[PDB]
PDB file of C-alpha atoms (C1' of nucleotides) in Angstrom:
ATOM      1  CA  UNK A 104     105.326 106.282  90.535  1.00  0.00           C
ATOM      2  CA  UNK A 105     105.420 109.818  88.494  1.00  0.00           C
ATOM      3  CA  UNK A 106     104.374 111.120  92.229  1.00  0.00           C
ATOM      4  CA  UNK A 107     107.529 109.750  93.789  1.00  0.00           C
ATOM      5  CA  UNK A 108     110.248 110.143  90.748  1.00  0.00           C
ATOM      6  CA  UNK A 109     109.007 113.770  90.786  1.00  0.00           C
ATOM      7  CA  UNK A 110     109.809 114.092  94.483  1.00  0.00           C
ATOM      8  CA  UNK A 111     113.370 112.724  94.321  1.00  0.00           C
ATOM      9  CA  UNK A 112     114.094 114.457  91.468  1.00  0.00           C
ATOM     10  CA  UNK A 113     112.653 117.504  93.381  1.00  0.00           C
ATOM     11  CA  UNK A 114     115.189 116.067  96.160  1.00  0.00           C
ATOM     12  CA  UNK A 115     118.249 116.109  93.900  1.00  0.00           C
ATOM     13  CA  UNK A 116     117.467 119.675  92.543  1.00  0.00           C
ATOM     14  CA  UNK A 117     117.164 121.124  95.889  1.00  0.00           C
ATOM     15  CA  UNK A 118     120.435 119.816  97.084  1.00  0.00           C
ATOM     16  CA  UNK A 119     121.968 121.614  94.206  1.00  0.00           C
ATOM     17  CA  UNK A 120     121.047 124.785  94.625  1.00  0.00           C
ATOM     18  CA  UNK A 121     121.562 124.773  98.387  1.00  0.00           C
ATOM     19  CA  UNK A 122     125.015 123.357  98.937  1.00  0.00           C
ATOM     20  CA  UNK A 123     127.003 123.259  95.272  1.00  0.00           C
ATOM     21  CA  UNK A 124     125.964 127.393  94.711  1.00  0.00           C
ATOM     22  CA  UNK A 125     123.642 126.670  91.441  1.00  0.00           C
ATOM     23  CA  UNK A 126     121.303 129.253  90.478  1.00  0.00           C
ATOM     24  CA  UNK A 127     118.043 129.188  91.149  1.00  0.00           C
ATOM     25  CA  UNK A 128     116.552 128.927  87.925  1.00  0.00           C
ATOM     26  CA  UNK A 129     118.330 125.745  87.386  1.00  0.00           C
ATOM     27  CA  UNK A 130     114.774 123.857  88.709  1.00  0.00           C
ATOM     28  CA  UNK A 131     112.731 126.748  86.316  1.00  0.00           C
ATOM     29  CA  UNK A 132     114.314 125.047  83.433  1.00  0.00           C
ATOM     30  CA  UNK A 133     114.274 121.655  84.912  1.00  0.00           C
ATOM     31  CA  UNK A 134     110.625 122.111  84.954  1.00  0.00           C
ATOM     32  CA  UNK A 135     109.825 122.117  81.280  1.00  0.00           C
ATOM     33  CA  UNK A 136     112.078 119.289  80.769  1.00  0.00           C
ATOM     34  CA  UNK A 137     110.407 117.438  83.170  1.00  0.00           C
ATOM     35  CA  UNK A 138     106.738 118.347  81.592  1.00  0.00           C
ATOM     36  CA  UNK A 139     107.573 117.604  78.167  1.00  0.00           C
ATOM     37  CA  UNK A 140     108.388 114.169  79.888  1.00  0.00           C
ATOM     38  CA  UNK A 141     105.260 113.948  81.278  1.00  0.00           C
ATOM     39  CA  UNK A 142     103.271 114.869  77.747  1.00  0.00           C
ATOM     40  CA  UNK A 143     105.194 111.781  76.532  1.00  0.00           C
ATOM     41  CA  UNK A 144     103.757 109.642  78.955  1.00  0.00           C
ATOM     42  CA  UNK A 145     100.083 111.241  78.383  1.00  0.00           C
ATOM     43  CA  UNK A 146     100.677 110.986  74.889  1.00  0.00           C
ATOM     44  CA  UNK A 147     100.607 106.717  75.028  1.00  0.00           C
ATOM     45  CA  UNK A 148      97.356 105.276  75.470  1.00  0.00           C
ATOM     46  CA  UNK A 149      96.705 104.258  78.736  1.00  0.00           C
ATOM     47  CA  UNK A 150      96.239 100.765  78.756  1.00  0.00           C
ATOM     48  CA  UNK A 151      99.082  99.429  78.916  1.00  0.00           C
ATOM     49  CA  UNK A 152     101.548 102.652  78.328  1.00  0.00           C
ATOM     50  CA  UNK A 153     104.935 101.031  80.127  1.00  0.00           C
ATOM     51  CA  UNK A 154     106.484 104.494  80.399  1.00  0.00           C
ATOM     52  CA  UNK A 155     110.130 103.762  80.456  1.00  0.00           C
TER      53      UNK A 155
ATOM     54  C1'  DA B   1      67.103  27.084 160.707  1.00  0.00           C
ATOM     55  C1'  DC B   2      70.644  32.116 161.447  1.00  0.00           C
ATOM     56  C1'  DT B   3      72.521  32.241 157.678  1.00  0.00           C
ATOM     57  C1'  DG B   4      75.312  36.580 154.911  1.00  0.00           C
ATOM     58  C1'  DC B   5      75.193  41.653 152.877  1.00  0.00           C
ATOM     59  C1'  DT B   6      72.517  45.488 152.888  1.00  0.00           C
ATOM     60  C1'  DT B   7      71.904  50.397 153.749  1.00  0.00           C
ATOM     61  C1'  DT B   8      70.524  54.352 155.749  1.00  0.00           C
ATOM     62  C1'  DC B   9      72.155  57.200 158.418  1.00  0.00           C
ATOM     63  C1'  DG B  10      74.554  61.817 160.373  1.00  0.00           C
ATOM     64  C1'  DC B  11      75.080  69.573 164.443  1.00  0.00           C
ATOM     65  C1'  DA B  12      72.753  75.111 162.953  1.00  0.00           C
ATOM     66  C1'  DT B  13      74.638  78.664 159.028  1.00  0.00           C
ATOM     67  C1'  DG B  14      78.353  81.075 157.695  1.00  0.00           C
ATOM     68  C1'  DA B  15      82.497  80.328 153.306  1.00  0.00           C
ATOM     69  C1'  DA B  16      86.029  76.719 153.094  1.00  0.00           C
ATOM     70  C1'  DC B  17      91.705  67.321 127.866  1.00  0.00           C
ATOM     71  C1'  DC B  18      94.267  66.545 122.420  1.00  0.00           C
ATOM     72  C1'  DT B  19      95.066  67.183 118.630  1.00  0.00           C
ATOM     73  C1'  DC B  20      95.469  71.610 115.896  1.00  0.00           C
ATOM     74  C1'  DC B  21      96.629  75.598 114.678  1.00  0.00           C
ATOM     75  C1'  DC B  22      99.232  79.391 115.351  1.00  0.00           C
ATOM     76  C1'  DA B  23     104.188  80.923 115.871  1.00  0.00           C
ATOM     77  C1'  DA B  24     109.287  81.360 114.985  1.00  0.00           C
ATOM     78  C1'  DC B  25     113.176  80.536 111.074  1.00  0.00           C
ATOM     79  C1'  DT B  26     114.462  79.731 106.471  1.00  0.00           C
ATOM     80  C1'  DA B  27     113.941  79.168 100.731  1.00  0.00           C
ATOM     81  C1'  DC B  28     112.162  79.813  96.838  1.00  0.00           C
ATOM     82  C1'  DT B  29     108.694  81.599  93.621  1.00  0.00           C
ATOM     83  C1'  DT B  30     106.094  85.738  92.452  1.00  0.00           C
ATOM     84  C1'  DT B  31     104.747  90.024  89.381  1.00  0.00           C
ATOM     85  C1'  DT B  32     105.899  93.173  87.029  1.00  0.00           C
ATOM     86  C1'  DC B  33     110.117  96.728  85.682  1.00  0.00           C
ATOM     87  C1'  DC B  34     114.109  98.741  82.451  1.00  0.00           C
ATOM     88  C1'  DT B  35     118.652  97.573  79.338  1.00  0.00           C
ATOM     89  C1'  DC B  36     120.891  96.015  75.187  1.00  0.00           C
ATOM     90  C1'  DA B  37     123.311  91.928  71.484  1.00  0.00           C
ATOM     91  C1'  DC B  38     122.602  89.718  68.184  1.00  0.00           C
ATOM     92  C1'  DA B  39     121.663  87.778  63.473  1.00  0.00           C
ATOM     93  C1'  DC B  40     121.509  89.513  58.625  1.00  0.00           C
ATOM     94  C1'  DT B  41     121.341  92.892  53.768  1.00  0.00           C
ATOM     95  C1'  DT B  42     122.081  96.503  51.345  1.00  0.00           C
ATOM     96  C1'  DG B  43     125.680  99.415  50.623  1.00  0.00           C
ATOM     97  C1'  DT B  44     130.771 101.400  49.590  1.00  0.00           C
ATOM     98  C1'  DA B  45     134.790 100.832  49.531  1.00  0.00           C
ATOM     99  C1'  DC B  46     138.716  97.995  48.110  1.00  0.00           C
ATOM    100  C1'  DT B  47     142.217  95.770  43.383  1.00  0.00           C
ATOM    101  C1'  DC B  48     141.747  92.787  40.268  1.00  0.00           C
ATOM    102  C1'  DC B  49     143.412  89.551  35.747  1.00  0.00           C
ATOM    103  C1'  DA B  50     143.039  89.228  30.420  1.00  0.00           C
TER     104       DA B  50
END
DNA sequence: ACTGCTTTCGCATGAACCTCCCAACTACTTTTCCTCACACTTGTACTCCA
């Protein structure tokens, strides 16, 4: 799932940028805001997590 | 007695089905998701009523 909602939200970003004239380091900070995310989700035990 | 009913035969060689289970077309359950409203209880505000 984390695979795909990456790669739409990679989608989204990259329509941004390309047709409503945001800079580019728009997805640089996106990035860390999507990690941090991602340490939330590695942060729950495994078994069981039900990352919202 | 001659009755009936048998029966064996034939020109070479060449070519000359029945349930049953799977299909279409629907519906209704399946197998996990995220998204809040509700019921109280301590709290702070109110104005007393003698």
């Amino acid at each position: 799932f984390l695979k795909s909602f990456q790669f739409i939200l990679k989608r989204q970003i990259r329509w941004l940028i390309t047709e409503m004239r945001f800079p580019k380091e728009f997805e640089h900070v996106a990035k860390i805001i999507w990690l941090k995310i991602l340490k939330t989700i590695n942060d729950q035990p495994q078994e069981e997590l039900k990352l919202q």
